[PDB]
Structure 1
């Protein structure tokens, strides 16, 4: 009669919370989805071994189209868990799944875990200064989307930071790198010419947040565009004007050029 939405956290099998693990262990059935994001520091086998339960993986279609025929039926006479990378309900369409549970007469509870939305605090950028967030998508065929560029412009214009999620092809296990994102934004800039993203724009790259050894780098596009940030996933951030303390952290912790202490403050 109960469905538990449990987050797996940021990077590996140990990023689930103690509460999430203990509840998952008591569930009769355990489902998971890795189409919204993958757990790059672990494997399904390692997550299964930790939880001590067979984990049934669900595809995007399984969830978006058939959540009520696959997960909810079991949740009516058993305790069921639905595992997702990061924090539950962060993915845009997941909150609606709780409405489906209610419509099916199934109680649901949420067990939180770390999300990139809060983990970016490790960049030293003040959380309150982040504005609207966006995703950088690959142009395809006759389609060249550029809304994420407008988001950066509107945020920066108001002195706010912009969190940029990079395109991911979950099943194909293909990720957009920070380098690719930068190249794309420069191309968008050439078309928009709004002076929003250029070789002189200061950016911050966060890779493998959650890991004990994440990659945190800050610098100008002209210098970071061809830098190796390691294995994905990569997160790109275009900060707005910096508080001197944010600048100092980026220099001391993220290897940013001392130049930002006067150019971007």
Structure 2
């Protein structure tokens, strides 16, 4: 009787750690969700094939309202695994599920996997220089989210980089592109006018991290806002003050304008 929170990683079924795979293979029941992120390089079939078990996919409602009714009951008499994209506890509310497990007398263990949060390292930006992170959320009806704009501003004043997770509506199959995130940010800039995000702002786009050929691009909003970065998932990053080697990397690897090599100390 035990519950394992196992991350499947960034892009495909092979992004799971060996630890996670060997443990999953031996579990009596295997559950999973695919609404907290998008694994663009795999399918349930390949995952099931790899694990050798039938996987039951849970919806956000199943998890958020019925985890203790669907999963925990089985964990009391068996070994259960709950799979999620990337790392199970990063930018999700799955951590709270460990409390529910506890209160049900079920021991839980966490098996990490590569996460988008650390994969930003591939952009060449020093990961220790990232500040507070935020999520660019799709406006809905008359409600237009904007706090993420304030995060960029706060980080920028401190010279820190800003990681922007992009919205996702799995059931509607909606995956926010970096382009849409940029459009929303310009609209918020027009609203607040803090000179935080404009056509001249340098940004970095990372798409489908985890694949052998992710899309890594850096440049000014005016030039990237309409560029095709390939299929989702995408994340947008607004760098703060750059170190020379960061700029060098963005130019050499992410095709940024050579002019950014000239940093303003």
TM range (shorter): over 0.9
Q: How far did residue 38 of structure 1 move?
A: 2.0
CA distance in 1, matches of 2:227, 2:47: 32
Alpha carbons 2:244, 2:263 under 8 Å: kept: no
DSSP 3-state at the match of 2:262: helix
Gaps of 5+ in 1: none
Give the TM-score normalised by the residue count of structure 1. 0.98
Q: Relative to structure 1, is the Cα distance of residues 264 and 235 closer, same or farther in structure 2, using a 3 angstrom cutoff?
A: farther
Q: How far did residue 182 of structure 1 move?
A: 0.7
DSSP 3-state at the match of 2:30: strand
Q: How far did residue 92 of structure 1 move?
A: 3.4
CA distance in 2, matches of 1:121, 1:161: 12
DSSP 3-state at the match of 1:259: helix
CA distance in 1, matches of 2:41, 2:92: 24
Alpha carbons 2:8, 2:86 under 8 Å: kept: yes
Alpha carbons 2:36, 2:92 under 8 Å: kept: no
C-alpha deviations, 1:147-205, integer Å up to 9, x for none? 00000000011000000011111112111111111111011101110000000000000
C-alpha deviations, 1:124-153, integer Å up to 9, x for none? 101111011111012222111100000000
CA distance in 2, matches of 1:111, 1:3: 11
Deviating more after overlay: 131-140 vs 7-16: 131-140
Q: How far did residue 90 of structure 1 move?
A: 1.3
Q: How far did residue 27 of structure 1 move?
A: 0.2
* Superposition misfits of 4+ residues, deviation over 6 angstroms: none
Q: How far did residue 264 of structure 1 move?
A: 5.7
Q: How far did residue 263 of structure 1 move?
A: 4.8
CA distance in 1, matches of 2:264, 2:16: 37
Alpha carbons 2:161, 2:238 under 8 Å: kept: yes
C-alpha deviations, 1:203-259, integer Å up to 9, x for none? 000000000000000000011111110111111000001010100010011001111
CA distance in 1, matches of 2:103, 2:258: 56
Q: Relative to structure 1, is the Cα distance of residues 80 and 264 closer, same or farther in structure 2, using a 3 angstrom cutoff?
A: farther
Deviating more after overlay: 166-175 vs 238-247: 166-175
C-alpha deviations, 1:11-70, integer Å up to 9, x for none? 001000101000000000000001111211111111111111000000101111111110
Q: Relative to structure 1, is the Cα distance of residues 143 and 122 closer, same or farther in structure 2, using a 3 angstrom cutoff?
A: same
Instruction: Say whether 1:29 aligns with 2:29.
Output: yes
Give the TM-score normalised by the residue count of structure 2. 0.98
Instruction: Say whether 1:45 aligns with 2:45.
Output: yes
CA distance in 2, matches of 1:139, 1:171: 17
Alpha carbons 2:243, 2:263 under 8 Å: kept: no
DSSP 3-state at the match of 1:263: coil
C-alpha deviations, 1:61-97, integer Å up to 9, x for none? 1111111110001001100000000012113311110
CA distance in 1, matches of 2:68, 2:234: 33
